[PDB]
Amino acid sequence: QPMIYICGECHTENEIKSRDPIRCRECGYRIMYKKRTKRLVVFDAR
Amino acid sequence: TVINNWLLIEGHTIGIGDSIADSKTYQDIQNTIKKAKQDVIEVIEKAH
Amino acid sequence: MIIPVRCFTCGKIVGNKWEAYLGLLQAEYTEGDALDALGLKRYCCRRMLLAHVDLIEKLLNYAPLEK
Amino acid sequence: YNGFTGRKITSQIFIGPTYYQRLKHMVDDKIHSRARGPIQILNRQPMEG
Amino acid sequence: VYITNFHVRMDTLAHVLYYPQKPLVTTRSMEYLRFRELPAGINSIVAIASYTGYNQEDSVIMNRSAVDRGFFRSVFYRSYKEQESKKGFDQEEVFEKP
Amino acid sequence: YARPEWMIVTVLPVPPLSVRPAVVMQGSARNQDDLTHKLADIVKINNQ
RNA sequence: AAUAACCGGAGAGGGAACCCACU
Ligand SMILES: [Zn+2]
Ligand SMILES: [Zn+2]
Structure with a gap:
C-alpha cells in the first residue's frame, strides 16, 4: 500500500504514507521524487 | 504537371557563379564611380 | 547530445571514432590531418566529427537525483 | 544525378554545407478542428483556444 | 539545449534537441556567448535547385533517411502543477484515486 | 411610443x-x- | 411449481486584465 519515494540529497529510499510530513527519515529533506513504474515498456527502435 | 516534370530533368538553380562578373566590367565600375566621386568633390569645392 | 552513431547522409559508422579522435588531438595533430588519418574522406562525414559538441560530460558533471 | 530516372541533371547545381535551426512552431501545436463541442456561459457560442 | 541542467529544471514548454552542433562557419564573437557549448541547430548539406516542384515558396524537400537517422529529432517537455487545498470544512481537497 | 416624463425614470x-x-x-x-x-448596492441604497 | 429489471443509463462549467510570439 505505501509507496516508495527517493530523498534527493540523500539518494535514500524511504516510505511515506498519505497525509504525512514529507521528510527523509534521517535528514528530513523536503524535496521528494517518485520512483519508476513496474509496468513494462517497449520501444520500436524507429 | 508537365512543365514541372520537364524541370525535373532540365534543372533550374542559382549559385554564387551567377553573382560574379568579369574584371573588365569591374574596372568600368571603378572608373565610373571614381569619375562621379571626383566630380561631386569638385562641386563641393565650388560650393565652398 | 552524443556522437551520432551514423552519418546523417551516408550511413558510415561514426560513433566509434570519437574517443580515438580525441586521443589523436591530444597527440598533437592538426585536426585535419588527424581526421584524415582516422579515415573520413567526404566532407559530408568530416563535418560531424569536426564540428560536433560533446555535452554529455556537462550532463554527467551533476549528481544523480534518482537512485 | 536524378534518382528516379538516373539521367544526369542538365544544369550544374549549387550545393554545400550550411546551418539550420528548426523552430518552435511545430505543426502538431497548431492543427485543430471543432464539431459542436462546448459553449460559453454568457452566450451560446463555441469556446475559444 | 537551452540550458545545461534541463533534466532537473522543471520548466513549462521546454524544447530540447538531440544533436546540437557548433556551426561550421561562424563569427569570432560567437564563442563569447558560450554558443559553442550550447549550440542550437544542425549543419545540413543543402542544394539550391528546384528539384521536384514541391518546394515553390519558402518550402524545402527533406531527405527522409536523415530524419530517420537522427536529423533534427527533437524532444518536447511540459510540466503540470496542482495545489491540493484544505478549507474551512466546506471543502477539503485531497489526493486520492477517485 | 415616447413621452417627455418617461425620460425621467422612477x-x-x-x-x-x-x-x-x-x-x-x-x-x-x-x-x-x-x-x-x-444591483445589490442599488437596492441597499434604495431601502436605506 | 415462478420469468428478458439500460445489457459500454456520457456532457463538459468560470472569467477578466496584462505581456509575449506567429501573418
Ligand atoms: Zn535524506
Ligand atoms: Zn557522409
Missing part, C-alpha cells in the same frame, strides 16, 4: 439571470459577476 428595470450568470469555481460558487454587486 422604476429601475432589472434583467433575468441570463444577463448576469452565476458561476462556480472549485465548487465555491462565490464567483458573482459585477451586475449582481451593482
Whole structure:
C-alpha cells in the first residue's frame, strides 16, 4: 500500500504514507521524487 | 504537371557563379564611380 | 547530445571514432590531418566529427537525483 | 544525378554545407478542428483556444 | 539545449534537441556567448535547385533517411502543477484515486 | 411610443439571470459577476 | 411449481486584465 519515494540529497529510499510530513527519515529533506513504474515498456527502435 | 516534370530533368538553380562578373566590367565600375566621386568633390569645392 | 552513431547522409559508422579522435588531438595533430588519418574522406562525414559538441560530460558533471 | 530516372541533371547545381535551426512552431501545436463541442456561459457560442 | 541542467529544471514548454552542433562557419564573437557549448541547430548539406516542384515558396524537400537517422529529432517537455487545498470544512481537497 | 416624463425614470428595470450568470469555481460558487454587486448596492441604497 | 429489471443509463462549467510570439 505505501509507496516508495527517493530523498534527493540523500539518494535514500524511504516510505511515506498519505497525509504525512514529507521528510527523509534521517535528514528530513523536503524535496521528494517518485520512483519508476513496474509496468513494462517497449520501444520500436524507429 | 508537365512543365514541372520537364524541370525535373532540365534543372533550374542559382549559385554564387551567377553573382560574379568579369574584371573588365569591374574596372568600368571603378572608373565610373571614381569619375562621379571626383566630380561631386569638385562641386563641393565650388560650393565652398 | 552524443556522437551520432551514423552519418546523417551516408550511413558510415561514426560513433566509434570519437574517443580515438580525441586521443589523436591530444597527440598533437592538426585536426585535419588527424581526421584524415582516422579515415573520413567526404566532407559530408568530416563535418560531424569536426564540428560536433560533446555535452554529455556537462550532463554527467551533476549528481544523480534518482537512485 | 536524378534518382528516379538516373539521367544526369542538365544544369550544374549549387550545393554545400550550411546551418539550420528548426523552430518552435511545430505543426502538431497548431492543427485543430471543432464539431459542436462546448459553449460559453454568457452566450451560446463555441469556446475559444 | 537551452540550458545545461534541463533534466532537473522543471520548466513549462521546454524544447530540447538531440544533436546540437557548433556551426561550421561562424563569427569570432560567437564563442563569447558560450554558443559553442550550447549550440542550437544542425549543419545540413543543402542544394539550391528546384528539384521536384514541391518546394515553390519558402518550402524545402527533406531527405527522409536523415530524419530517420537522427536529423533534427527533437524532444518536447511540459510540466503540470496542482495545489491540493484544505478549507474551512466546506471543502477539503485531497489526493486520492477517485 | 415616447413621452417627455418617461425620460425621467422612477422604476429601475432589472434583467433575468441570463444577463448576469452565476458561476462556480472549485465548487465555491462565490464567483458573482459585477451586475449582481451593482444591483445589490442599488437596492441597499434604495431601502436605506 | 415462478420469468428478458439500460445489457459500454456520457456532457463538459468560470472569467477578466496584462505581456509575449506567429501573418
Ligand atoms: Zn535524506
Ligand atoms: Zn557522409
